[PDB]
Coordinates of C-alpha atoms in Angstrom, one line a residue:
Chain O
X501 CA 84.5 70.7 100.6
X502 CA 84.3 72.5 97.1
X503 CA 82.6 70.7 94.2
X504 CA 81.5 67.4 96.4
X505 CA 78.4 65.6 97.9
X506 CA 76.6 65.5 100.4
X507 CA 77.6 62.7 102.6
X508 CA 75.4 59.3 103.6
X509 CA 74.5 60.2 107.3
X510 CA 76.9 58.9 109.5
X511 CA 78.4 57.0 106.8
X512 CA 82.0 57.9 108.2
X513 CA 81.2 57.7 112.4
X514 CA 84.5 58.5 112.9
X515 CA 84.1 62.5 111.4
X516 CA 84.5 64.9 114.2
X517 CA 83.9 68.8 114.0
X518 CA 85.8 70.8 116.7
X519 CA 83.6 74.0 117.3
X520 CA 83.8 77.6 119.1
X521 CA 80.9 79.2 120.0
X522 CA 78.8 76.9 118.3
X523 CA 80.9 77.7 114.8
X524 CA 82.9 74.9 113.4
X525 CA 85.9 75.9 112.6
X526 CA 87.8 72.3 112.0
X527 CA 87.8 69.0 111.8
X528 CA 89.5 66.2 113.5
X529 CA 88.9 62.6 113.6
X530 CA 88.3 60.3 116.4
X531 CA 91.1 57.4 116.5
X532 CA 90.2 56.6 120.1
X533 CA 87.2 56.8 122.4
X534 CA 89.0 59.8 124.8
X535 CA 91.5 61.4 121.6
X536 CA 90.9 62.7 118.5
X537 CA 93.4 63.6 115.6
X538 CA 93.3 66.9 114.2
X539 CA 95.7 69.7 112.3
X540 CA 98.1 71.2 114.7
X541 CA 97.1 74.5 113.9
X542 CA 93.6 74.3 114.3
X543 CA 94.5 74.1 118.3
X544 CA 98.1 76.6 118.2
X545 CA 95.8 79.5 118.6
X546 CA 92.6 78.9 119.6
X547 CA 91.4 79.0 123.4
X548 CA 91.7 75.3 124.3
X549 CA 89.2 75.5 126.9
X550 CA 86.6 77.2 124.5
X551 CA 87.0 74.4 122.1
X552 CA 84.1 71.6 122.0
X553 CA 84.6 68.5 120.3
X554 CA 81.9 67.3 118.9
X555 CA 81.6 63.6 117.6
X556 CA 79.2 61.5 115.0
X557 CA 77.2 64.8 114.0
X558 CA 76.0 64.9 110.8
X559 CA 73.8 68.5 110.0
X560 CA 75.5 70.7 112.1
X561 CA 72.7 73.2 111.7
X562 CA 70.4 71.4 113.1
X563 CA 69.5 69.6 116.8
X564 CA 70.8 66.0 116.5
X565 CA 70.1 63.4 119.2
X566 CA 73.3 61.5 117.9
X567 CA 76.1 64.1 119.2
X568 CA 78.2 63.6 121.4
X569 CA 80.1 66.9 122.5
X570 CA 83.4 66.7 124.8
X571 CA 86.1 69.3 126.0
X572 CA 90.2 69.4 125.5
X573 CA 92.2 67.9 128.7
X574 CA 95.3 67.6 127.0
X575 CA 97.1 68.4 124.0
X576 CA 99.8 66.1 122.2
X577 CA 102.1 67.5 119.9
X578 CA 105.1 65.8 117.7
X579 CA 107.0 69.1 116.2
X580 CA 104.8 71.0 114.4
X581 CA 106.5 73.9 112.3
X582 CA 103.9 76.7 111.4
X583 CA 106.9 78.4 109.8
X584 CA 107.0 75.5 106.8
X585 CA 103.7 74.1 107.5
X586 CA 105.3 70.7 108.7
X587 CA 104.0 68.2 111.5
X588 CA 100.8 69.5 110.6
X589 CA 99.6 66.7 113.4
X590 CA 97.6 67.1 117.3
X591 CA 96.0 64.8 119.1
X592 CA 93.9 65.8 121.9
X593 CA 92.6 63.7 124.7
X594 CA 88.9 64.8 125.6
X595 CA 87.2 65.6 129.3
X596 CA 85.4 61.7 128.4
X597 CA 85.5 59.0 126.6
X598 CA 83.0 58.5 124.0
X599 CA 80.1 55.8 123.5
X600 CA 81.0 53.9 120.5
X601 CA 77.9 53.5 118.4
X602 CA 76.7 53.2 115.1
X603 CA 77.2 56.7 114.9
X604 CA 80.2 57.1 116.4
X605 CA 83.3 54.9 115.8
X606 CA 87.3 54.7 116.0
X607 CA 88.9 54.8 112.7
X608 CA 91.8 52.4 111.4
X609 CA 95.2 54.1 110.3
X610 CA 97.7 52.9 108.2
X611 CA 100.7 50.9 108.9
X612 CA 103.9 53.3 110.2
X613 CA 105.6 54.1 106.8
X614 CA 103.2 53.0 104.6
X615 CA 103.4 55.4 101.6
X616 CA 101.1 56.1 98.9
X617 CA 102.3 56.2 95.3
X618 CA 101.1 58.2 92.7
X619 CA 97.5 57.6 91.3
X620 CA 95.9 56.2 94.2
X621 CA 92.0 57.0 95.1
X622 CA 91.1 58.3 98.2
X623 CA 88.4 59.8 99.8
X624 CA 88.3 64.0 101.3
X625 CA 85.6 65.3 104.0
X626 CA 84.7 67.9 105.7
X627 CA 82.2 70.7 106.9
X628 CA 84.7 73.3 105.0
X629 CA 83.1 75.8 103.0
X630 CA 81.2 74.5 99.8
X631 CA 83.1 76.8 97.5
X632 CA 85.1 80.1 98.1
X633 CA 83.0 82.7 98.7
X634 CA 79.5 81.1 98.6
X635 CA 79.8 80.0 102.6
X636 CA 80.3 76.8 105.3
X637 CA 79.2 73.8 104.8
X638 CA 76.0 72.5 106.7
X639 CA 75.8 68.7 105.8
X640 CA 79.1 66.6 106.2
X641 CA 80.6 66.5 102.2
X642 CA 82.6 64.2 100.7
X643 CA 84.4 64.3 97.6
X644 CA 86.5 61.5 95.5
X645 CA 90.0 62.7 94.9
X646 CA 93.5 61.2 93.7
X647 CA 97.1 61.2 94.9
X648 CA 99.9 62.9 93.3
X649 CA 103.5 63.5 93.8
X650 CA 103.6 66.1 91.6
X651 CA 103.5 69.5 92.8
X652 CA 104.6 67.9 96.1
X653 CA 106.8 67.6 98.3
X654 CA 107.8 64.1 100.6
X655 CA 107.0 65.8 103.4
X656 CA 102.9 66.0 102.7
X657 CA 100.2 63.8 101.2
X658 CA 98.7 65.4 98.1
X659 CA 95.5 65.0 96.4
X660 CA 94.1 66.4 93.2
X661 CA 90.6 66.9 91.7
X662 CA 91.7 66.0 88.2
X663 CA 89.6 68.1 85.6
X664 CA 87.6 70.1 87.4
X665 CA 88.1 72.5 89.6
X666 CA 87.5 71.0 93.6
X667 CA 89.1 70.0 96.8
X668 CA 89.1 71.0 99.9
X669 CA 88.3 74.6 101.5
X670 CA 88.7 76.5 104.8
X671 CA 87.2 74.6 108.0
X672 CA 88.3 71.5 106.1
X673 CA 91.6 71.6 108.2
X674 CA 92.2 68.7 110.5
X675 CA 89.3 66.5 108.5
X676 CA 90.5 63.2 107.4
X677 CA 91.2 61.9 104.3
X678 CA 90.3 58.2 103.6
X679 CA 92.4 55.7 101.0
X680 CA 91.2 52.1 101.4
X681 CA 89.6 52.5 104.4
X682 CA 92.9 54.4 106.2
X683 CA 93.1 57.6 107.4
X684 CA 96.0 58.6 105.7
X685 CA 95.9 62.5 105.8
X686 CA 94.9 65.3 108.0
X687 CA 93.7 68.2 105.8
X688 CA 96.5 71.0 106.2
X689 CA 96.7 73.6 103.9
X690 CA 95.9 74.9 100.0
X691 CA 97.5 76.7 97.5
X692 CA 96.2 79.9 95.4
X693 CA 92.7 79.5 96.9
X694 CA 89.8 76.9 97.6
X695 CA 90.0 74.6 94.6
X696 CA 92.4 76.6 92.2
X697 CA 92.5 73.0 90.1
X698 CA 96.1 73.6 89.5
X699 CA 97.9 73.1 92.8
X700 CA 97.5 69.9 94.8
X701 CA 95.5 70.6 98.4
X702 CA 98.0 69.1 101.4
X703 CA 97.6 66.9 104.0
X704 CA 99.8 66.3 107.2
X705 CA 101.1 62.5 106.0
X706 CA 99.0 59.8 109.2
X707 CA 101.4 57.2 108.1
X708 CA 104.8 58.8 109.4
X709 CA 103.7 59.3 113.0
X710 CA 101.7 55.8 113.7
X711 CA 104.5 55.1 116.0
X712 CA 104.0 58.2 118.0
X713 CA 100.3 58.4 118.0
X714 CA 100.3 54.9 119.5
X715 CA 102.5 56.0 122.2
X716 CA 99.9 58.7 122.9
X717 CA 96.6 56.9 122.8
X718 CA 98.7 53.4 124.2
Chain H
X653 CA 77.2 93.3 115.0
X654 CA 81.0 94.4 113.7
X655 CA 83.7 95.3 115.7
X656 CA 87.3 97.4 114.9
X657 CA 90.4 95.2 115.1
X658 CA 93.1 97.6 114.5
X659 CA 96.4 97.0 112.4
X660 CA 99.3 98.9 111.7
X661 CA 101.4 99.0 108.6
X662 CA 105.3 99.5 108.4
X663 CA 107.0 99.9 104.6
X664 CA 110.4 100.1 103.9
X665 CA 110.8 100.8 107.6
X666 CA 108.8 103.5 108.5
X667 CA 105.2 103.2 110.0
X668 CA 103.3 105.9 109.8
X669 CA 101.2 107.3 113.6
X670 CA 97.6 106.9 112.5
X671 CA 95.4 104.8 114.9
X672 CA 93.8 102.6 112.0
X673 CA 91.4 99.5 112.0
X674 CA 89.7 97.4 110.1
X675 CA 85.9 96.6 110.3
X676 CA 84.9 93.3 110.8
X677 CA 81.7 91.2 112.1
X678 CA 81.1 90.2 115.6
X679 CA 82.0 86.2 116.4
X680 CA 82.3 85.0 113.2
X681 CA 84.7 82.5 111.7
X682 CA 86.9 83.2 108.7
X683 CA 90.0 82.2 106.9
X684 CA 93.5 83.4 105.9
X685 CA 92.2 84.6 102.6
X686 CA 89.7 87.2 104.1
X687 CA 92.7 88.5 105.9
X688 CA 94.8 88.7 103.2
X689 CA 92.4 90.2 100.8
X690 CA 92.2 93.6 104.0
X691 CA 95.7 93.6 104.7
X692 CA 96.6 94.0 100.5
X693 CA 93.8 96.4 100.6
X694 CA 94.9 98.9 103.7
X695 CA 98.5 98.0 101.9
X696 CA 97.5 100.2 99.3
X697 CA 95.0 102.8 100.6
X698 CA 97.5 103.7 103.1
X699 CA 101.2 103.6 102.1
X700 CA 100.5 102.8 98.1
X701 CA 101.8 98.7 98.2
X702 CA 100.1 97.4 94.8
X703 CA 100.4 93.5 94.0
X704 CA 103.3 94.3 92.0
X705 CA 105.4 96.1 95.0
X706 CA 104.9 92.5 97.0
X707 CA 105.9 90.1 94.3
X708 CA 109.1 92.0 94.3
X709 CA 109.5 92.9 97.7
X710 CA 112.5 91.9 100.0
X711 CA 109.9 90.1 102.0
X712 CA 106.3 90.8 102.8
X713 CA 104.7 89.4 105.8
X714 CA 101.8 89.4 108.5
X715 CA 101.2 89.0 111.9
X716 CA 97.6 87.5 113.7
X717 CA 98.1 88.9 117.5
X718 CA 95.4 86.9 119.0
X719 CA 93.8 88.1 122.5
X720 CA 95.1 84.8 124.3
X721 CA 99.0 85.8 123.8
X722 CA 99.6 83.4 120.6
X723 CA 100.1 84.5 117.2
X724 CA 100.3 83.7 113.9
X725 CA 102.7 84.5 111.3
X726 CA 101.9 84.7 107.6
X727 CA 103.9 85.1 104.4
X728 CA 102.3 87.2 101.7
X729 CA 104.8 86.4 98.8
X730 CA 103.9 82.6 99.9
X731 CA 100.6 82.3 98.2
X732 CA 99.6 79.1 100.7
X733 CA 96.6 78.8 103.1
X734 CA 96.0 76.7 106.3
X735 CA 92.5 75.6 105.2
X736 CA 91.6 76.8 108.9
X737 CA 88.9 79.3 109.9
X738 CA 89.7 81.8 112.7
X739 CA 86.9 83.7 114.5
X740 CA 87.1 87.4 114.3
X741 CA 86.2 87.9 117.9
X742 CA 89.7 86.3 119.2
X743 CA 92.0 88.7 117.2
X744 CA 93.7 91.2 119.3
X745 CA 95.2 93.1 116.2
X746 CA 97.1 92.6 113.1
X747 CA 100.8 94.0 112.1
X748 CA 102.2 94.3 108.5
X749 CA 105.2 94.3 107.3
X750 CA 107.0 95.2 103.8
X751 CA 110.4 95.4 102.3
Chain C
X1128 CA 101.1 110.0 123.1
X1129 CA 104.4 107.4 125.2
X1130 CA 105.6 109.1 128.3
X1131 CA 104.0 111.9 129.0
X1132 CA 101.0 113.2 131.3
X1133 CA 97.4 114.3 131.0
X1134 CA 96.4 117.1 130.0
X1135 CA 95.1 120.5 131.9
X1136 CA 91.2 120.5 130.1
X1137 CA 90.9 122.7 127.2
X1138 CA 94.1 124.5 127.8
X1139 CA 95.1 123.7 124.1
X1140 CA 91.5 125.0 122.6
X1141 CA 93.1 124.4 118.7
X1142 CA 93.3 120.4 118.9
X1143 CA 91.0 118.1 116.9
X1144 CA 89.9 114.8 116.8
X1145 CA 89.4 113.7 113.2
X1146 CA 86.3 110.4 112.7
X1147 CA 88.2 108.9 109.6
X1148 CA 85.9 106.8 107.2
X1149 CA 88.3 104.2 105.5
X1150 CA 87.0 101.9 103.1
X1151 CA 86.8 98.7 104.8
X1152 CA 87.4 100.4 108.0
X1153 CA 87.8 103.8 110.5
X1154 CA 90.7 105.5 111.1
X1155 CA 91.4 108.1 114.3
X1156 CA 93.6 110.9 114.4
X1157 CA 94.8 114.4 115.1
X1158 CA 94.7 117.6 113.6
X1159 CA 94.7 121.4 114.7
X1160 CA 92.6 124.4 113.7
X1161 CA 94.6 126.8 111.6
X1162 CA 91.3 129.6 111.1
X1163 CA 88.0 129.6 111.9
X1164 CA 87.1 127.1 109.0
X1165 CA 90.3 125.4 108.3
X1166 CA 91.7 122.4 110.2
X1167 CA 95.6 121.3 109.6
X1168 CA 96.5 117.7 110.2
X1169 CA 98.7 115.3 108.0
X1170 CA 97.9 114.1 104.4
X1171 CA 97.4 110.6 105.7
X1172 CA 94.9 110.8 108.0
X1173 CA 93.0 110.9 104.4
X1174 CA 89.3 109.4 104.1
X1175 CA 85.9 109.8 102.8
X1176 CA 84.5 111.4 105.4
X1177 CA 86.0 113.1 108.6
X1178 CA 84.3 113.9 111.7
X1179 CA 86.3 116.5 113.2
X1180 CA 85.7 116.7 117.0
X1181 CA 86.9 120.6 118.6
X1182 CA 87.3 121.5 122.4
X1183 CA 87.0 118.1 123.5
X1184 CA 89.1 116.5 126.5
X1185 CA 87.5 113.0 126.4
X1186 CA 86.3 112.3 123.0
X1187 CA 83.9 109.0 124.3
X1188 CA 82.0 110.8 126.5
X1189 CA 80.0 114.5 124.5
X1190 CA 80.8 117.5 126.8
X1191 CA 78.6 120.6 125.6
X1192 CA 82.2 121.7 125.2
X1193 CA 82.8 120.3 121.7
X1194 CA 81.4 120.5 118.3
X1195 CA 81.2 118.0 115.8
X1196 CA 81.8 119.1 112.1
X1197 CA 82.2 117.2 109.3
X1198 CA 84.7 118.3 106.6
X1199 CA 83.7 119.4 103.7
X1200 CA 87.2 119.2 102.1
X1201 CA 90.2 117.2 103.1
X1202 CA 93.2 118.3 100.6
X1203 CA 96.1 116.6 100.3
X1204 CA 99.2 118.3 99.2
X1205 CA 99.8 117.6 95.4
X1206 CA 103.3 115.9 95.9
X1207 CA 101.8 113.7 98.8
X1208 CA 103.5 110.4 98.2
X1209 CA 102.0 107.9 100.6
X1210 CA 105.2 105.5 99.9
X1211 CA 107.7 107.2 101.3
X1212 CA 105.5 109.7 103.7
X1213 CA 106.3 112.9 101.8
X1214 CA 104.9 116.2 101.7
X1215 CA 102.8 114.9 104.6
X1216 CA 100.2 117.6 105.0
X1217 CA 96.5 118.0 104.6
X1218 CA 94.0 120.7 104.6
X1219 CA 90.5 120.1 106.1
X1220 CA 88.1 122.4 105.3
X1221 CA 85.3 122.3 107.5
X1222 CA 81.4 123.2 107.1
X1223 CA 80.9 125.6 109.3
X1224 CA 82.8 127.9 111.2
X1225 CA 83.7 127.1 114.7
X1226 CA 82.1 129.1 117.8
X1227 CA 85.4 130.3 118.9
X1228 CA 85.4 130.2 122.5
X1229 CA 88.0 129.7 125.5
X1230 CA 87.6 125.8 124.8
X1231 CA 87.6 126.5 120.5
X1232 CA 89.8 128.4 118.6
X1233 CA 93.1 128.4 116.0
X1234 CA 96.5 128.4 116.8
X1235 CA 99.4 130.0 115.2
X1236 CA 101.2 129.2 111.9
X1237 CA 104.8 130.0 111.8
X1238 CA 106.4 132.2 109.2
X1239 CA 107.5 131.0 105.8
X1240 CA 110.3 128.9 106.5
X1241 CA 110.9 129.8 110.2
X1242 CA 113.7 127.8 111.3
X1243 CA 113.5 125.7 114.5
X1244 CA 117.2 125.1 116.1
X1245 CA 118.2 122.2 117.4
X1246 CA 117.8 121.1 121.2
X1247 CA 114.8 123.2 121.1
X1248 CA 111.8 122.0 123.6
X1249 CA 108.3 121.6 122.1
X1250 CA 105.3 119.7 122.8
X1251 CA 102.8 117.7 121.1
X1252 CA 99.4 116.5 122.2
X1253 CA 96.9 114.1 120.5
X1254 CA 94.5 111.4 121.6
X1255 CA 97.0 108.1 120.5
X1256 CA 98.1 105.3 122.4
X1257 CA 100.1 105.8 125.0
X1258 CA 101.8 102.1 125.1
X1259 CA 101.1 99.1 122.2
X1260 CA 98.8 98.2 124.4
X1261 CA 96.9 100.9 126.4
X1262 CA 95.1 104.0 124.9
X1263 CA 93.1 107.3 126.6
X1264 CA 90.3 108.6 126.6
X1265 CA 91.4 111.8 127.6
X1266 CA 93.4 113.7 125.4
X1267 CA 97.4 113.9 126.4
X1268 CA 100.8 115.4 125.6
X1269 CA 104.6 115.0 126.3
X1270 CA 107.6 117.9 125.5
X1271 CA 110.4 116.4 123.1
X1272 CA 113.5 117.7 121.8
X1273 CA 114.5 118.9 117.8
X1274 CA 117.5 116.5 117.0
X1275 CA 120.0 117.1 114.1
X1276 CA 119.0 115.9 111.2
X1277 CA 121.5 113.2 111.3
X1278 CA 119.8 111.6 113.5
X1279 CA 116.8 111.2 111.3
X1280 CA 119.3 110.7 108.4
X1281 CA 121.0 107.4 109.8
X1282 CA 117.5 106.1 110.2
X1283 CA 114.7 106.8 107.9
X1284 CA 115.4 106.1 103.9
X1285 CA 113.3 109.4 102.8
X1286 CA 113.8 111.5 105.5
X1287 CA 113.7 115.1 103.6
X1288 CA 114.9 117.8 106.1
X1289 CA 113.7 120.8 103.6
X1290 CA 110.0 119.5 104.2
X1291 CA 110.1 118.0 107.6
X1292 CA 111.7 118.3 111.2
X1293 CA 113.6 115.5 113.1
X1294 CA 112.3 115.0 116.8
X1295 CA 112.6 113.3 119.7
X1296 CA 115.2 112.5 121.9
X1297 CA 117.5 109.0 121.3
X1298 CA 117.7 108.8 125.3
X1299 CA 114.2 109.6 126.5
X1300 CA 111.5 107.5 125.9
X1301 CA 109.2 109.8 124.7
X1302 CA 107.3 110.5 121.5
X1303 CA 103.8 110.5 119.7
X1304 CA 102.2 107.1 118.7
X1305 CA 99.3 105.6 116.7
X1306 CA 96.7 108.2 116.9
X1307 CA 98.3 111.2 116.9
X1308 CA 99.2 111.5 113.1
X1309 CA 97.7 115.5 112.0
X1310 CA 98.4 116.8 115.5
X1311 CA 100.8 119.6 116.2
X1312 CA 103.9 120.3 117.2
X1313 CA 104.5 123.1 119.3
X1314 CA 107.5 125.4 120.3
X1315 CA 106.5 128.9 121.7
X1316 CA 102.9 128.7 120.6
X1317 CA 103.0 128.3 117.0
X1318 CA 102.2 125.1 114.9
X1319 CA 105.8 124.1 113.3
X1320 CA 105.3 120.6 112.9
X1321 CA 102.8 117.7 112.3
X1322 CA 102.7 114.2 113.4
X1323 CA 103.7 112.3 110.6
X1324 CA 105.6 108.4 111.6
X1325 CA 108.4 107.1 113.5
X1326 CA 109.5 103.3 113.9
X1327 CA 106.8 101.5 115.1
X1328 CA 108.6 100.9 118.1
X1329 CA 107.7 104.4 119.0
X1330 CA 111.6 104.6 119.8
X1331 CA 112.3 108.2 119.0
X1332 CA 113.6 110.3 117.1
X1333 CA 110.5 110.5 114.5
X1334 CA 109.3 112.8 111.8
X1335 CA 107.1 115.8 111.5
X1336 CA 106.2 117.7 108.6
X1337 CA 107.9 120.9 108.4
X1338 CA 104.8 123.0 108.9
X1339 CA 106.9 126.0 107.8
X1340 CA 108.4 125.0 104.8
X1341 CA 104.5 124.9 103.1
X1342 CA 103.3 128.0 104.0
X1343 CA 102.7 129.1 100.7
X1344 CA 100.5 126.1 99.7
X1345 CA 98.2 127.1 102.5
X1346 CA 97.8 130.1 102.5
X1347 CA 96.6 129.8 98.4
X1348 CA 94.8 126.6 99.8
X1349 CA 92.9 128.5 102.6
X1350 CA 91.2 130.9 99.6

């Protein structure tokens, strides 16, 4: 995350980071104790088997006795398009199913349909670089943004630093982003670069596939 | 430390018979932007493709051949950026594109 | 080099294998020694610096055979035009003279403007891939066919037939591939044309550069 804070440990349990080789690479966020919710195209060319999902970490640098770390059984897909960037939307049942803790915990999504208007304030994370060309993030960051419509299109969620230049950055994909306690976005893709300040960073819309993540996770 | 993924570049439909790679590190994850910022470069060292010769190209794309049998297709006149990282090690080679 | 066989060792003592420094990268081609300090090979195979490798068979092992020499000049013809691949020709000038042996030494340059007639059967060897996605260690070669330049006509935008040669037969699948850029082409022991491009399919025909029709260049080049 470009131009945001370091995070309260463990203040979101719910944070995942998917990892190969020991390098993050994306996010995704746990919405069930055996599935967790990521970008579709974090996993449409990665090998699945390599991939480690790794829950209520917090320094990723560092040994933590709080991790959690599972493997990919099977992959759930509702019509992703990495033509148009569209569906940007996975869910991924793990090799386990996880301890909920204090550390680690399911998130709440929204209602099916539920959309945001313009204005609203919402909440972007991530272990995504902490600003293009100066390197991955370390410690989880978070970062207070707003929703626009501007810029956008009905098919996404976008958010804007307003002001400054921030937002989301690469290894951000598949993070969450959090409006009123909801995740309501997965973190998909920018525009011009890392926090450009003049195009809106995009997130696969949570609230138009409640219905078909609860068929998955039941 | 690095390793040689090798790419090949085809203008105006012609590609010219050089065995050609790029240098990159060993296991290392990076993002769409790296690669674009190599592929505009060997665009211009090898067949003279400036910035100007893409914005008005026909069309001006890229294609990530990863090692598992998946790839990845970018636009270059698109300007937009799955906020993903890729690791270098899993890229089997890269093809180019321009019209 | 697609569809062809391996090569008898060292019975082509001109070849080289060129070590191309790129920024942000290496590059690997052919070439072919013209004299005793003089390397010809194509105008793309352009870099920094150029290890050129004589009298080798397999270039990732170091037989005593070989010699590595670094160039000391690579010139590119004045009317090189990397956008369309024109005038596609390079000097390399190398730092030393070679040892001339039965494994080292030049091969012959045609005559200003020799002609080459069509149908005629040539070969051309190089160190390239063989498939898109096998190479060789071991350096290779494969005999193609001069087409009319029609055929190059229909397909290729700049094809120029007063500065290069249309090769390769439409119903054969052979042809040289990715690494054999700067090598020769060669009908009746002479050095008419260099590996220049083709479709990336490495569907033939493809272009040389008309070794003959620059004659003059080199030969004021070469001092």
């Amino acid at each position: 995350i470009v131009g945001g804070r370091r995070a309260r440990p463990h203040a979101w349990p719910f944070m995942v980071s998917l990892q190969l080789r020991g390098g993050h690479f994306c996010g995704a966020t746990l919405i069930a104790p055996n599935f967790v919710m990521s970008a579709a195209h974090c996993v449409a060319n990665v090998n699945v088997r390599a991939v480690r999902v790794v829950l209520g970490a917090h320094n990723l640098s560092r040994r933590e006795p709080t991790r959690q770390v599972f493997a990919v059984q099977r992959i759930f897909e509702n019509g992703y398009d990495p033509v148009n960037l569209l569906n940007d939307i996975v869910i991924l049942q793990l090799n386990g199913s996880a301890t909920i803790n204090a550390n680690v915990q399911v998130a709440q999504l929204p209602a099916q349909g539920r959309r945001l208007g313009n204005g609203v304030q919402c909440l972007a994370m991530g272990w995504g670089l902490l600003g293009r060309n100066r390197g991955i993030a370390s410690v989880l960051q978070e970062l207070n943004v707003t929703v626009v419509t501007s810029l956008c299109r009905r098919s996404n969620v976008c958010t804007l630093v307003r002001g400054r230049q921030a937002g989301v950055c690469f290894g951000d994909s598949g993070s969450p982003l959090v409006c009123n306690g909801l995740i309501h976005g997965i973190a998909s893709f920018v525009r011009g670069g890392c926090a450009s300040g003049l195009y809106p960073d995009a997130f696969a819309p949570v609230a138009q596939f409640v219905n078909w993540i609860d068929s998955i996770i039941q | 430390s690095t390793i040689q993924i090798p790419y090949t570049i085809t203008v105006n439909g012609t590609s010219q018979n050089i065995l050609s790679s790029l240098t990159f590190n060993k296991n290392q994850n990076i993002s769409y932007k790296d690669i674009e910022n190599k592929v505009k470069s060997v665009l211009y060292f090898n067949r003279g493709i400036s910035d100007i010769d893409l914005r008005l190209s026909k069309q001006a794309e890229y294609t990530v051949h990863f090692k598992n049998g998946t790839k990845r297709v970018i636009d270059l006149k698109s300007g937009i950026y799955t906020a993903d990282l890729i690791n270098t090690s899993d890229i089997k080679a890269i093809s180019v594109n321009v019209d | 080099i697609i569809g062809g066989r391996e090569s008898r060792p060292h019975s082509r003592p001109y070849m080289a294998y060129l070590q191309i420094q790129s920024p942000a990268g290496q590059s690997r081609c052919g070439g072919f020694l013209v004299r005793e300090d003089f390397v010809l090979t194509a105008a793309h195979c352009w870099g920094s610096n150029i290890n050129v490798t004589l009298g080798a068979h397999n270039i990732q092992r170091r037989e005593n055979t070989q010699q590595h020499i670094t160039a000391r000049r690579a010139i590119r013809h004045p009317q090189y035009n990397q956008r369309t691949i024109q005038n596609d020709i390079m000097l390399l000038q190398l730092s030393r003279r070679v040892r001339r042996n039965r494994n080292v030494n030049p091969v012959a340059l045609p005559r200003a403007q020799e002609g080459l007639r069509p149908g005629t059967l040539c070969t051309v060897a190089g160190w390239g891939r063989v498939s898109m996605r096998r190479g060789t260690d071991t350096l290779r070669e494969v005999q193609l066919r001069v087409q009319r330049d029609r055929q190059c006509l229909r397909i290729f935008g700049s094809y120029d037939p007063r500065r290069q040669i249309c090769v390769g037969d439409r119903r054969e699948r052979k042809a040289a591939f990715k690494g054999d850029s700067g090598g020769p082409l060669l009908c009746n022991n002479v050095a008419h044309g260099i590996v220049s491009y083709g479709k990336s399919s490495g569907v033939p025909p493809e272009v040389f550069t008309r070794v003959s029709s620059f004659l003059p260049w080199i030969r004021t080049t070469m001092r």
